[PDB]
Design a protein around this motif. Sequence first.
Motif, short mmCIF file in Angstrom:
data_model
loop_
_atom_site.label_atom_id
_atom_site.label_comp_id
_atom_site.label_asym_id
_atom_site.label_seq_id
_atom_site.Cartn_x
_atom_site.Cartn_y
_atom_site.Cartn_z
N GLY A 4 0.80 -1.20 0.00
CA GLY A 4 0.00 0.00 0.00
C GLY A 4 0.84 1.26 0.00
N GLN A 5 1.68 1.42 -1.01
CA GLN A 5 2.50 2.61 -1.15
C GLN A 5 2.24 3.30 -2.49
OE1 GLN A 5 6.64 1.59 -0.37
NE2 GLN A 5 6.10 0.89 1.68
N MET A 6 2.00 2.51 -3.52
CA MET A 6 1.71 3.05 -4.85
C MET A 6 0.21 3.21 -5.05
SD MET A 6 2.78 4.14 -7.80
CE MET A 6 4.50 3.65 -7.70
N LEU A 7 -0.51 2.10 -4.98
CA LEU A 7 -1.95 2.12 -5.24
C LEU A 7 -2.76 1.78 -3.99
CD1 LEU A 7 -2.11 0.44 -8.76
CD2 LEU A 7 -2.22 2.87 -8.17
N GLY A 8 -2.08 1.36 -2.94
CA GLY A 8 -2.76 1.03 -1.69
C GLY A 8 -3.10 2.27 -0.88
N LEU A 9 -2.18 2.66 0.00
CA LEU A 9 -2.33 3.84 0.85
C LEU A 9 -3.49 3.70 1.83
CD1 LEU A 9 -0.98 4.72 -1.95
CD2 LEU A 9 -1.41 7.05 -1.16
N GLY A 10 -4.67 4.15 1.43
CA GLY A 10 -5.79 4.20 2.35
C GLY A 10 -5.58 5.26 3.41
N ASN A 11 -5.13 6.43 2.98
CA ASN A 11 -4.77 7.51 3.90
C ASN A 11 -5.87 8.56 3.98
OD1 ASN A 11 -3.54 8.38 1.05
ND2 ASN A 11 -3.86 10.25 2.25
N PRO A 12 -5.91 9.32 5.08
CA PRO A 12 -6.82 10.46 5.22
C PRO A 12 -6.39 11.62 4.31
CG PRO A 12 -5.94 9.75 7.36
CD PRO A 12 -5.10 9.13 6.28
#
Length: 80
Positions: free
Chosen positions: A72-80
Amino acid sequence: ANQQTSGKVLYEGKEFDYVFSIDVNEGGPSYKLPYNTSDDPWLTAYNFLQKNDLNPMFLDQVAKFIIDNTKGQMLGLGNP
């Protein structure tokens, strides 16, 4: 096996957890990288690489994409 069968990917007639779609050549067969989320990148990628007879140079590229799917760094993330 397959406690949940929501998102499965079809490649050449077979279904896998998450196969990646690889474009690089224009006009020709598409490259699909069947990954089970509990399998190792370099292994899964190597599997496809030896399966479709690709160059070992591709192994890192495919494996890294494999990783990011569960990372989750390129297309994952899931960040605010």
